[PDB]
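Exercise: predict the structure of this protein bound to IMH.
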Amino acid sequence: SAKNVVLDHDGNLDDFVAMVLLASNTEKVRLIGALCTDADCFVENGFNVTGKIMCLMHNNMNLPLFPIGKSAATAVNPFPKEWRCLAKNMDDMPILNIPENVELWDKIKAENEKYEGQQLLADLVMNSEEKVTICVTGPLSNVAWCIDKYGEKFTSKVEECVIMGGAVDVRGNVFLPSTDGTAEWNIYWDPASAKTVFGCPGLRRIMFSLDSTNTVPVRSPYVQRFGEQTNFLLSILVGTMWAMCTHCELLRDGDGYYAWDALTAAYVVDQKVANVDPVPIDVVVDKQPNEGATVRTDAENYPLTFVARNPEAEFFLDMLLRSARAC
Amino acid sequence: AKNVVLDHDGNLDDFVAMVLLASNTEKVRLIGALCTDADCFVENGFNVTGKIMCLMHNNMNLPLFPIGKSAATAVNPFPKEWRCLAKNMDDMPILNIPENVELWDKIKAENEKYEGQQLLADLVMNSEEKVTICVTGPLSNVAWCIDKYGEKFTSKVEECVIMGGAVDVRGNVFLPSTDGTAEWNIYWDPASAKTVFGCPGLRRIMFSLDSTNTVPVRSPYVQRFGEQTNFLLSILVGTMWAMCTHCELLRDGDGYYAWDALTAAYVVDQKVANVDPVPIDVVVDKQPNEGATVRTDAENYPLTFVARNPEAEFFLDMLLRSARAC
Ligand SMILES: O=c1[nH]cnc2c([C@@H]3N[C@H](CO)[C@@H](O)[C@H]3O)c[nH]c12
Ligand SMILES: O=c1[nH]cnc2c([C@@H]3N[C@H](CO)[C@@H](O)[C@H]3O)c[nH]c12
Ligand SMILES: [Ca+2]
Ligand SMILES: [Ca+2]
Ligand code: NI
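Solution:
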């Protein structure tokens, strides 16, 4: 029935909406673990939010508990500090601090505390009986670390990697004085690791770059519909996180917030989310204006990556609204 | 219960303040509210005021009341990032339950017709008993009323409980052109502030940063609303505070405080804090200290009762309990 999945995320709002999608769809996904990286959040906050959401869901829908580990990966280029604070706010949301759920997390916290994110990813994959799908909604540093340490012994156990990252035929979202805006943030955080992943042979990769994520901006109308399901803990949770993003486009002309990681996780639940196109992907790692950019390379026999195209937005929007009703 | 009118500018503490005043029907009869385009975008701030009112009306004995948008304009606008918080609340699921949004949609046309400043003037003056004005945004609207009606307006005011200024502590307006002595609410419109604090015949209770600095919004307390998720107001208040606990780390010590909430608590119950009389003047000049509240030696200068040593635990318990109103 369900396939094994590990969520490799960096604790922002869409990372958590992504978590809820994967966790709530028990018929399609068997969530066997998660790791949080100190990228688009402060790892301690992301770690606790991951734990709190898991416990809330364990008590309300019998979701099997799984290991959560903090990655030791460090940044090449850190995310803006303002974005990394979001996990802190979520750690304090009343919906994630219900006594029975917080009590459970407190009971299993010390154990998960002992895990090192990167080694955990490698063990969950390599020790799994069946192959494992890795959903990467943060930087690629952990998959790369596993690839460098274990090579084929690791990749051969990977069903596929579904990745939120990049921008192939559309501009990126990294706008700084020294960049040209063609790079996307997850790749930009650790270019070298991304390149390692995208160049790895014997590894299936599904890539959700901005080309596809640009079709799902977070808008008020849709977000307010979660207000129709306040009887469900996950709807209060998902709607709240989304409600915290509807201002972005207004704050930075058009450079709004999108359901990046959410759309990516949705594909893991049901590939009908989008079709794909094979593309040889390389990553600019030098200190150039487009550092972090994902570009097609025509190097001989370069491994292919399946780039998502023309996502089924309506299907995705209905999936999220109904998944937020699992409990 | 005494008649109260909330004069706010739509930020997170403004809304918690609103909940505090509205939920305590035993001490406060909330007869109206106005929102100013200051620390929010008036449309979002107006709409959230409406959404909160209807949520409460439909779940507890809270009479509906008029809500108006102020025509006041800024001298020095708030930071855009801060003004977006009302847009965020506007889309929160707890404020978008069908039954409450339907009510709001139904009474909206009546309220979106009121002019905030005139509404404040009419509510105060035509009231049978005297009215207490809780000001949690700039002082533009009370000044407008003073300018237009003078004594006819002030004589009907029980007292103005104002969240604003900094007297013996550093302010919180940190900009390239400022020296940090000014507090945001006064800074937004110095001249209106000057008018109110220099008004003879008007009683003023001032909650300056001197007292609000004892109430930073911190994680441990915020998480306690998690023990009350069966009450809509706890989900609402806890969610708003949860969106503030980050400021201290982001702004190196310059965190978020329960500024307007503390001010409002005192209206509910004065045991919240004692007061010291102080001649409060305001700097309106385009200097590095524009918007500063300073003691003046001028003879016959009207006194203002500045809050001192607030009862923190008392205030904190009041909010948690009030948050269980529904
Ligand atoms: O404006 C933003 N706020 C918070 N996170 C992101 C991101 C993060 N990077 C990825 C998309 O660029 C996605 O995983 C998301 O969590 C891009 N822009 C923002
Ligand atoms: O960092 C901030 N974010 C949002 N609002 C405020 C304020 C507003 N100004 C008053 C306190 O200085 C109070 O009414 C509050 O709503 C000061 N600092 C901030
Ligand atoms: Ca992410
Ligand atoms: Ca305010
Ligand atoms: Ni009614």
